């Protein structure tokens, strides 16, 4: 279920990462010349492509999203793993070749799991079903996060769908728009 994946993304990740995020940003700024200085820059921006096309490297889908650095790692004992490592990446977003914004950015990994699952021989299901699962994942997550008062200021969910009708969509522009709000 998208249900289970949403509960998993909360319980196994956001729940653990959001409370410590700002301390990790303060440290990043101390080490990297106050690079994450704007208020728009102190959130985790999470990409939810409802089509579930999720590359591992962001430059594969948009040339204007450039890797810059990692936040300090977070270590937590988890399910018998001592110091399980939780990591996040800081990117610089270009506009017309100009550094236009800096933020912590990533995809919601479970959507990449739905993609792979939907295509497998036995596990598979239709694209229309995957779309509905992806939408349900976002909806179920948004429901969970209403009991998480901190989430509002530590993360931003960017949900979108790629056009297929000849209309242009720039992922970089969209991320910039959120950073700037």
Which residues contribute to the annotated binding site for 3',3'-cGAMP?
A: 13, 84
Classified as helix, coil or strand, 172 is helix
For 173, counting Cβ atoms within 10 Å of its Cβ (0-12 exposed, 13-18 middle, 19+ buried), the class is middle
User: Which of ligand 1YD, its own copies, none lies near 163, with the C-beta cut-off 5 to 8 A by kind?
Assistant: none
Q: Are 68 and 90 in contact, with CB atoms under 8 Å apart?
A: yes
Q: Which value, in Å, is the radius of gyration of the alpha carbons in the chain?
A: 17
Binding residue (CB under 6 A) for ligand 1YD from 7, 86, 115, 125: 86
Annotated binding site for 2',3'-cGAMP: 84, 109
**Rounded Cα–Cα distance for residues 26 and 119 (Å):** 42
Residues 62-101 that bind its own copies (CB under 8 A): 67, 70, 73, 76-85, 87-89, 91
Residue of 50, 102, 105, 141 interacting with its own copies (CB under 8 A):
105
Applying the rule CB under 8 A, the residues between 24 and 53 that interact with its own copies are: 47
Q: Does 153 bind its own copies (CB under 8 A)?
A: no
Considering the complex, what minimum distance in angstroms separates the CB of residue 35 from ligand 1YD?
A: 19
Q: Which residue among 22, 29, 109, 173 contacts ligand 1YD (CB under 6 A)?
A: 109
CA distances from 172 to 30, 52, 179 (A): 27, 17, 11
**β-pair type (44-49, 65-70):** unpaired
**Residue 84 makes contact with ligand 1YD by CB under 6 A:** yes
Tell me how far CA of residue 4 lies from CA of 133, 134, 175, in angstroms: 11, 12, 27
Q: How buried is 139 (Cβ within 10 angstroms: 0-12 exposed, 13-18 middle, 19+ buried)? A: middle
**Binding residues for its own copies (CB under 8 A):** 1-5, 7-8, 11-12, 47, 54-58, 67, 70, 73, 76-85, 87-89, 91, 105-110, 112-114, 116-117, 120, 123
Where on the chain is the footprint of ligand 1YD (CB under 6 A)? 8-9, 12-13, 81, 84, 86-87, 106, 109-110, 113
């Amino acid at each position: 279920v998208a249900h289970g994946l949403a509960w998993s993304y909360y319980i196994g990740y956001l729940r653990l990462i959001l409370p410590g995020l700002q301390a990790r940003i303060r440290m990043f700024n101390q080490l990297h010349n106050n690079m994450l200085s704007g208020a728009g820059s102190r959130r985790l921006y999470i990409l939810f492509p409802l089509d579930c096309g999720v590359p591992d490297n962001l430059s594969v889908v948009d040339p204007n999203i450039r890797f810059r650095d990692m936040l300090p790692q977070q270590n937590i004992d988890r399910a018998g793993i001592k110091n399980r490592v939780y990591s996040n990446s800081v990117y610089e977003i270009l506009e017309n070749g100009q550094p236009a914004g800096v933020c912590i950015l990533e995809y919601a990994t479970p959507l990449q799991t739905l993609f792979a699952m939907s295509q497998d021989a036995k596990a598979g299901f239709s694209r229309e079903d995957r779309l509905e699962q992806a939408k349900l994942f976002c909806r179920t997550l948004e429901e969970i996060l209403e009991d998480v008062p901190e989430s509002r200021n530590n993360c931003r969910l960017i949900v979108y769908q790629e056009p297929t009708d000849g209309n242009s969509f720039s992922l970089s522009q969209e991320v910039l728009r959120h950073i700037r709000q």
